[PDB]
Chains A and B, each alone.
Chain A
């Protein structure tokens, strides 16, 4: 049904319409490339304002209606776990590949020759990256050059003023939850929380689990050195339901009887913590005033009003289990911790619970601070980009010089190997060499320099001067050769940037018909 009111696009003009749907996405994000990338204003659906230039926030928030532009949204679900640094880089690469393919479509070449020709030239550019890559941590492990490379990818944003102490934190967080010889870094084992107030220098590395809940009473001790934590859902008190107790009393004969019936329950379940051997009582609900007076005398602290996901996040790090009531209390499901402390922040009444193990754990949490809440969500993503580069260093310590140095040397090898291809895929190989030069050309355009004058000077430098590649001066430094300026990208991040860009042009050029049924 519904044949009337249906948009159709077929013929040769549907091929250029899919190019124009992809050219609108690339031209917006060719200005936000590099550390000198221009900011983007985001207007929320309810009226909030948040400004950023990150690539992963652009693709997730751009409510596009074209299905060709919706295919550009799909690459962000798999790229942020792989490269983390070239989200703006693959969009301009997929767009500029279709720019020269728009010129190739005027000649009459079929897109199944262009999609196969782009896959042919991508294997030459991938092979050229492995020949020019240099190692860092071959045959040994070291933590000193890993912080220097992490200082460059972190300081590309506004958090460059405190990039030193935050780069040492992300190195020790990955090395605790994961080993370098195992090469299995888990992103779910590293959590990042934050609260308003303070500076960026007050970032502390908590090896364990943090929850934003205080103790059940202000007279509770703030130091638990014993590794026995009972995590339950019902507090050690007379039993109350989940929503509303609503105890009915008739007269003073029922109030006197229910008080003695509650005084037995106030004496039993409080002393039921000592028969098992637990010290901390993390319960989902709070405690009463009569229970808090008894917890002070027996030296047993407790955490009140712990939320839904806050319970399960503690028991994974400490190795505990969600206990439903007091009858299932065993010593095997009790949590383990080295230091449970409460840390306040000035006059703020947050008083979060800091559970530390004081050892090499398997779940580490990072608490960042700042003067505004928009900087805390920016610094969380800033450390998340730093976690992927260290993850790429563990899987492969070989690295390649970024900042346009790897892109120009790849364009020289592809154009040299294009003459050895005596078929109709030769024009697609020369198309791949021209689109590879656009990413270092957009780097110099965002820096305020002439884009063509800056590009061809490195062409005479990477050929006539020296065979090692030289970078493009993007941060207005003294000279070229960004290897001396310590701006180096990863090899896996540069190989998958080429492969994902070829994958999206192959899926776009093969699509030649769209049918959109409207309303009836």
Chain B
């Protein structure tokens, strides 16, 4: 009747590790098919009933939330992958579980897990020095300008897509968008907007901030668009006559104050409009909708107004204009006002759009898409976001390696040759570490629908002859030199993915007993 546990969940030994190895593979199976540009997307619905459609590995693991202990160790590695390099959560999640799969029969035969720890620290340290030797610095090779080279890598990334016919036009726009930025490159600075209707040739690139402008109220035939130096105001105040938040209800029984009651309710709107006139804001941007009466106010005062602006586009306008977002109207002064050189109301796509050009802090851009469907523009937005990512990493890091499994099949060949010259327990473990690194060219053939065994048998035969930069091709169903086809990746992200996958595989192997407190 006297128990030591009394509800304490605890177990140790060999099958506690086998239960932790197989529990690691259920997280890798959630992001196994999402690898590659042609990968399958997952459908995740929240508690409210909204379905989310995405194939990004960072968005899948953030909405999984598995209560298993070994599954929580793959979450913070994907969190640290965003801080170390910026992306690569689906690469280190798949690579961590395949390290444990190849050593899973070796644990059951009686081998100690600490010897597998000493092999993972050894082969990963050799993989760091092997990457930097094969990595070549391509800065001014063959006397070609870097603007021509940046259009070549985006052409292969945008190939086999909806805009694969007109990829020559889309490759020149993604290079000039990053070239418009400063030395501090960021994917959040270049925004993508969608305009329904028209062919694919009508896609434009805004040098500044452009938003959807769903303001469909009155205000035509006045409020001229062209301004030399307007004062950009970012508000969050409703300017309607009968607003849901700004009203005045006083209950008197006199007929003299009944004129003053409607006048006091109008004075809430009029004093909020008079403070914008004193501050000198030529353009009025508000999140809440603006009524038809306030549009008649700025029409005679030679100013512009446009409400129903999202708060995401208001913060991008704040980073462009250099001002500040002010909710109230009495604090509206020149400290929070912005400035630009060109502002105009365009008629691209049949609807009205507003955009600023010539900001002093113009570090943000806007990409306008044109097409016959919004889901055509939704997949074009994610493909152009992928086209910006390959261009951005080529400018920051010059020392690059060949992608497409070329650096993974070369690391599998060197670590297999090093294992044959090492006696002891490091031969069967590092040799299993080299075979576990072949899951990146194997899952790239699985998600692309190709023959996974017909390509990988010819890919390893190409590496055995002396091919150091041969990998899989997403367009053709054969192997190709990814260095000649401009399929690149920097050496620093390939190194940091290997030291994160080896650290995530070492944390599972070093755990042998689970302690749970009853509460």
Asked whether any CB of chain B lies closer than 8 Å to the CB of A462, the reply is: no
Please give, as numbers and ranges, the residues of chain B lying within 8 Å of A184 by CB-CB distance: 350
> Do residues A513 and B241 form an inter-chain contact, with CB atoms below 8 A?
no
Q: Which residue, of A71, A316, A513, has the highest number of chain B Cβ atoms within 10 A?
A: A513
Q: Which residue of B lies closest to A67 (CB)?
A: B51
In Å, the complex CA distance between A325 and B293 comes to: 12
Asked whether any CB of chain A lies closer than 8 Å to the CB of B66, the reply is: yes
Please give, as numbers and ranges, the residues of chain A lying within 8 Å of B51 by CB-CB distance: 67, 70-71
> Do residues B449 and A512 form an inter-chain contact, with CB atoms below 8 A?
no
Contacts A247-B255, A424-B449, A514-B43 given; does A1 touch B350 at CB 8 Å = no
Please tell me which one of the listed residues B266, B292, B477 contacts residue A312 in the complex, with CB atoms under 8 A apart: B292
In Å, the complex CA distance between A172 and B456 comes to: 66
Number of residues in A with C-beta < 8 Å to the partner? 49
Please give, as numbers and ranges, the residues of chain A lying within 8 Å of B261 by CB-CB distance: 241
> Do residues B292 and A321 form an inter-chain contact, with CB atoms below 8 A?
yes
> Do residues B266 and A324 form an inter-chain contact, with CB atoms below 8 A?
yes
Closest chain A CB from B71 CB (angstroms): 9
Asked whether any CB of chain B lies closer than 8 Å to the CB of A110, the reply is: yes
Asked whether any CB of chain A lies closer than 8 Å to the CB of B30, the reply is: yes
Asked whether any CB of chain B lies closer than 8 Å to the CB of A43, the reply is: no
Please give, as numbers and ranges, the residues of chain A lying within 8 Å of B29 by CB-CB distance: 10
Asked whether any CB of chain B lies closer than 8 Å to the CB of A197, the reply is: no
Please give, as numbers and ranges, the residues of chain A lying within 8 Å of B376 by CB-CB distance: 503
In Å, the complex CA distance between A316 and B217 comes to: 11
Q: Which residue of A lies closest to B449 (CB)?
A: A110
Please tell me which one of the listed residues A70, A496, A513, A516 contacts residue B30 in the complex, with CB atoms under 8 A apart: A513
Please give, as numbers and ranges, the residues of chain A lying within 8 Å of B40 by CB-CB distance: 111-112, 510-512
Closest chain A CB from B202 CB (angstroms): 15
Please tell me which one of the listed residues A1, A262, A324 contacts residue B293 in the complex, with CB atoms under 8 A apart: A324
Please give, as numbers and ranges, the residues of chain B lying within 8 Å of A515 by CB-CB distance: 42-45, 64
> Do residues A496 and B372 form an inter-chain contact, with CB atoms below 8 A?
yes
> Do residues B262 and A324 form an inter-chain contact, with CB atoms below 8 A?
yes
Asked whether any CB of chain A lies closer than 8 Å to the CB of B258, the reply is: yes
Q: Which residue, of B43, B218, B258, has the highest number of chain A Cβ atoms within 10 A?
A: B43
Asked whether any CB of chain B lies closer than 8 Å to the CB of A453, the reply is: no
> Do residues A1 and B65 form an inter-chain contact, with CB atoms below 8 A?
yes
> Do residues A503 and B373 form an inter-chain contact, with CB atoms below 8 A?
yes
> Do residues B292 and A246 form an inter-chain contact, with CB atoms below 8 A?
no
Asked whether any CB of chain B lies closer than 8 Å to the CB of A124, the reply is: no
In Å, the complex CA distance between A513 and B259 comes to: 64
> Do residues B45 and A67 form an inter-chain contact, with CB atoms below 8 A?
yes
Which of A232-240, A290-298, A334-342, A375-383 faces chain B?
Answer: A232-240
Q: Which residue of B lies closest to A515 (CB)?
A: B44
Q: Write out, one digit per residue, whether chain A residues 205-245 have a CB within 8 A of any chain B CB (1) or not (0).
A: 00000000000000000000000000000100011110001
Asked whether any CB of chain A lies closer than 8 Å to the CB of B33, the reply is: yes
Asked whether any CB of chain A lies closer than 8 Å to the CB of B53, the reply is: yes
User: Restricting to B270-305, which residues have a CB under 8 Å from any CB of A?
Assistant: 292-293, 296
Contacts A78-B374, A110-B449, A239-B259 given; does A507 touch B53 at CB 8 Å = yes
Please tell me which one of the listed residues B41, B253, B350, B448 contacts residue A246 in the complex, with CB atoms under 8 A apart: B253
Asked whether any CB of chain B lies closer than 8 Å to the CB of A189, the reply is: no
In Å, the complex CA distance between A246 and B251 comes to: 10
Q: Write out, one digit per residue, whether chain A residues 252-267 have a CB within 8 A of any chain B CB (1) or not (0).
A: 0000001001100000
> Do residues A503 and B375 form an inter-chain contact, with CB atoms below 8 A?
yes
Closest chain B CB from A72 CB (angstroms): 12
Please give, as numbers and ranges, the residues of chain B lying within 8 Å of A128 by CB-CB distance: none
Please give, as numbers and ranges, the residues of chain A lying within 8 Å of B392 by CB-CB distance: none
Q: Write out, one digit per residue, whether chain B residues 296-323 have a CB within 8 A of any chain A CB (1) or not (0).
A: 1000000000000000000000000000
Please give, as numbers and ranges, the residues of chain B lying within 8 Å of A514 by CB-CB distance: 43, 45
Asked whether any CB of chain B lies closer than 8 Å to the CB of A2, the reply is: yes
Q: Write out, one digit per residue, whether chain B residues 408-449 have a CB within 8 A of any chain A CB (1) or not (0).
A: 000000000000000000000000000000000000000111
Closest chain A CB from B341 CB (angstroms): 31
Asked whether any CB of chain B lies closer than 8 Å to the CB of A113, the reply is: yes
> Do residues A112 and B255 form an inter-chain contact, with CB atoms below 8 A?
no
In Å, the complex CA distance between A248 and B261 comes to: 17
Asked whether any CB of chain B lies closer than 8 Å to the CB of A499, the reply is: yes
Asked whether any CB of chain A lies closer than 8 Å to the CB of B7, the reply is: no
Asked whether any CB of chain B lies closer than 8 Å to the CB of A517, the reply is: yes
Asked whether any CB of chain B lies closer than 8 Å to the CB of A3, the reply is: yes
In Å, the complex CA distance between A510 and B44 comes to: 14
In Å, the complex CA distance between A184 and B350 comes to: 8
Closest chain B CB from A267 CB (angstroms): 15
Asked whether any CB of chain B lies closer than 8 Å to the CB of A171, the reply is: no
Please give, as numbers and ranges, the residues of chain A lying within 8 Å of B518 by CB-CB distance: none
In Å, the complex CA distance between A512 and B43 comes to: 8
In Å, the complex CA distance between A319 and B144 comes to: 61
Q: Which residue, of B33, B40, B42, B262, has the highest number of chain A Cβ atoms within 10 A?
A: B40
Asked whether any CB of chain B lies closer than 8 Å to the CB of A322, the reply is: yes
> Do residues B45 and A516 form an inter-chain contact, with CB atoms below 8 A?
yes
> Do residues B255 and A322 form an inter-chain contact, with CB atoms below 8 A?
no
Asked whether any CB of chain A lies closer than 8 Å to the CB of B38, the reply is: yes
> Do residues B255 and A239 form an inter-chain contact, with CB atoms below 8 A?
yes
Asked whether any CB of chain B lies closer than 8 Å to the CB of A413, the reply is: no
> Do residues B262 and A500 form an inter-chain contact, with CB atoms below 8 A?
no
Q: Which residue of B lies closest to A240 (CB)?
A: B258
Asked whether any CB of chain B lies closer than 8 Å to the CB of A109, the reply is: yes
In Å, the complex CA distance between A213 and B137 comes to: 79
Please give, as numbers and ranges, the residues of chain A lying within 8 Å of B46 by CB-CB distance: 517
Please give, as numbers and ranges, the residues of chain B lying within 8 Å of A423 by CB-CB distance: 477
> Do residues B449 and A112 form an inter-chain contact, with CB atoms below 8 A?
yes
Please give, as numbers and ranges, the residues of chain A lying within 8 Å of B447 by CB-CB distance: 112
In Å, the complex CA distance between A224 and B426 comes to: 101
Q: Which residue of A lies closest to B29 (CB)?
A: A10
In Å, the complex CA distance between A423 and B478 comes to: 13
> Do residues A511 and B41 form an inter-chain contact, with CB atoms below 8 A?
yes
Closest chain A CB from B400 CB (angstroms): 27
Contacts A78-B373, A503-B375, A507-B375 given; does A513 touch B293 at CB 8 Å = no
Closest chain A CB from B444 CB (angstroms): 12
Q: Which residue of B lies closest to A70 (CB)?
A: B51
> Do residues A499 and B258 form an inter-chain contact, with CB atoms below 8 A?
no
> Do residues A3 and B375 form an inter-chain contact, with CB atoms below 8 A?
no
In Å, the complex CA distance between A444 and B53 comes to: 38
In Å, the complex CA distance between A512 and B64 comes to: 16
Please give, as numbers and ranges, the residues of chain B lying within 8 Å of A1 by CB-CB distance: 65, 67
In Å, the complex CA distance between A262 and B477 comes to: 90
Q: List 15 A-B contacts (CB under 8 A).
A: A3-B65, A4-B67, A70-B51, A110-B449, A113-B449, A241-B261, A248-B253, A321-B292, A324-B262, A325-B262, A424-B449, A503-B375, A512-B33, A515-B42, A515-B45
Across chains A and B, which 4 residue pairs bring their CB atoms closest together, nearest first?
A: A110-B449, A3-B67, A113-B449, A248-B253
Identify the A interface with B (CB < 8 A): 1-4, 10, 67, 70-71, 78, 109-113, 116, 184, 234, 238-241, 245-248, 258, 261-262, 312, 316, 321-322, 324-325, 423-424, 496, 499-500, 503, 507, 510-517
